[PDB]
Design a protein around this ligand. Structure first.
Ligand code: 5F9
Lengths: 244, 240, 246
């Protein structure tokens, strides 16, 4: 009910359809994606394009919110496991902003073709949250350790042009461009691609949090600053965090 | 008979001389190369330039033999274990085993019309882990995915951008730089090289990696890729 | 008395300024000690961020144990400084106002963020002096300028300019000390716990590595080598060195 699924040549196009929420990921959207990924090429598709309707690729977790629901991360993790395990290369057609879980989604694609007005951001430091290790590692490999530090410690927006610079974007362009590239890739040897992908994803990005990481993570998540962050936003005022 | 070795002051230059096959490696040219690396600084060399004759640095492999992969493996061990900096004068296209060899150099100067490629996904093959890890460290994880999953070329300008090329220039340029390097203190260069090479790229394949590797190599698609080329037609891969 | 560093605070930003401009802010045992102390005691304190910077034309030109009374426990005093920066909950924005060479480049890399002047450069000139680096300096350099350019900096003492610092990501911005402070100010209005978590994970990328056994030997040789002696002679003599590889 919340995604579009089409196929032309051997390219499955999976489209996030919540444009009125900038494709924010609630629980239902996350389940429907997972399913669409697992059932990709049941079936004759050799590649997937993943993209969002409207002006955003994905605005992150739904602030309504599943974002702060306790069993929401597991659905996200299962989504990511499904993409990682799929033998299909996923070309992300990033048609506009990708934030939070939405950045995570974008980075879990195998390749990225990015629209000129799209940007990338982890606003974690504005909301007092904390990321899983994989997000941090993969971001570091895609924009380089220095920019990652700036994105993670200060919520720096990564522009499209700069995403093209560091490698996070492979190409700057449109959905049609992404679909055309996926067509090429769909004509390549699948076993070679499946091998590259698996080895690539096993670069060590996938990392269980160290004990200090887990403690700092929980401490951030169950902090009062989390409340203050959303309140200041809705009240359209600056936050006053207390570090607790 | 297949390589040229010369020396000017402190700099040993090793030139691939199979420009008829665009310097494609085989049984012999690799084994000769291994010796040139070992028997360098035998000798008063403090720096090696590595390069290729004609239009190509090395366009891959051409075995038109059974221990070729061994000889290839030992070649890499040699450049890795070697105590001297190797400036790759990448004079033209560096493809497959050629990109492997170019990456095994400690530094790179790349001719303006040279490019780098792993076309494995056009031929249905798989790479070892080290090639993937090091390519990732040199062109960044993002561009590495595009090279690995889509067989995309890395042009010289982007090689300079990412760090794969330290400079754009000629064999002459490489030699000029290699000479300044020969004047640097060897023990410092040795320690840095060993630690740099030990960044984790020298990695043994995970089980799933090995399953997918063997699967790709023994696939029918590998034949299809070759037969399709010979028939100037598009491949129809089965994924088997 | 007097100090080798200056400490001021504007709102929640603590600016620490290295003040050995006579020596281009070359580190010694006292300066390093004063710096360690200024980092632990920050945010003790209403400060939520640290701007690190150098007085004069250089950020920090490396090391100069010359007049130093306790230059003996300078290597260990240097390890302490790096742990305190790594352990600090405060994000540290280095304002690299000039050349950061050697230990100065190590210090620069231990900062959480870097705002670099247009005339600054970065350099590990260890191959000109025949020394060896610890694994962390090498790993963290690799992450900040990419593996390719890392070999070039380490094997041939290549200078990374401001402009190519921005390119690789070594320099987050090209700006002035004020610019570094305006940015740190913003960061000081962010949520400390999120920052604390990220920094700790980021520093635990693997760059903190114990030397492999083969690494230690090459390091110990390089440092015990005659060429180290030679390279100093050749400089204090004002002439090219003749390195022997021993
Ligand atoms: C093997 C696998 C290896 C990996 C393992 C798994 C890895 C994953 C594991 C993860 C598990 C760990 C924990 C998870 C950690 C991450 C979870 C939290 C991170 C988050 O995503 S939090 C949310 C952050 N996002 C934001 O704050 C978005 C801010 N900006 C915006 O929403 C928008 O302004 C833009 C997206 C930029 C677009 O702007 P615009 O076009 O001007 O639109 P606006 O006028 O602002 O909004 C239009 C309408 O959309 C609505 N909307 C926008 N965003 C959301 C949202 N996120 N949630 C709910 N509603 C949303 C907005 O309210 C508005 O509604 P209207 O007023 O009715 O028109």
């Amino acid at each position: 009910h919340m995604i579009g699924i089409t196929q032309a040549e051997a390219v499955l196009t999976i489209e996030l359809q919540r444009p009125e929420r900038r494709n924010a990921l609630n629980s239902q959207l996350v389940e429907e994606l997972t399913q669409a990924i697992r059932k990709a090429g049941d079936g004759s598709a050799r590649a997937i394009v993943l993209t969002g309707q409207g002006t955003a690729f994905c605005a992150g977790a739904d602030l309504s919110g599943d974002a702060f629901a306790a069993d929401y991360p597991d659905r996200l993790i299962e989504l990511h496991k499904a993409m990682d395990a799929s033998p299909m290369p996923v070309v992300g057609a990033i048609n506009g902003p990708a934030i939070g879980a939405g950045l995570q989604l974008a980075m879990q694609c195998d390749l990225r073709v990015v629209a000129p007005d799209a940007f990338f951001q982890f606003p974690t430091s504005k909301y007092g949250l904390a990321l899983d290790n994989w997000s941090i590692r993969r971001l570091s490999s895609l924009v380089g350790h220095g920019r990652a530090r700036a994105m993670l410690l200060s919520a720096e927006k990564l522009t499209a042009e700069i995403a093209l610079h560091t490698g996070m974007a492979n190409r700057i362009g449109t959905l049609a461009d992404a679909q055309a590239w996926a067509a090429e890739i769909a004509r390549l040897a699948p076993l070679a691609i499946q091998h590259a992908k698996r080895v690539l994803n096993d670069d060590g990005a996938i990392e269980e949090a160290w004990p200090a990481h887990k403690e700092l993570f929980d401490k951030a998540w169950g902090s009062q600053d989390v409340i203050e962050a959303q309140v200041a936003r809705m009240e359209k005022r600056p936050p006053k965090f207390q570090g607790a």
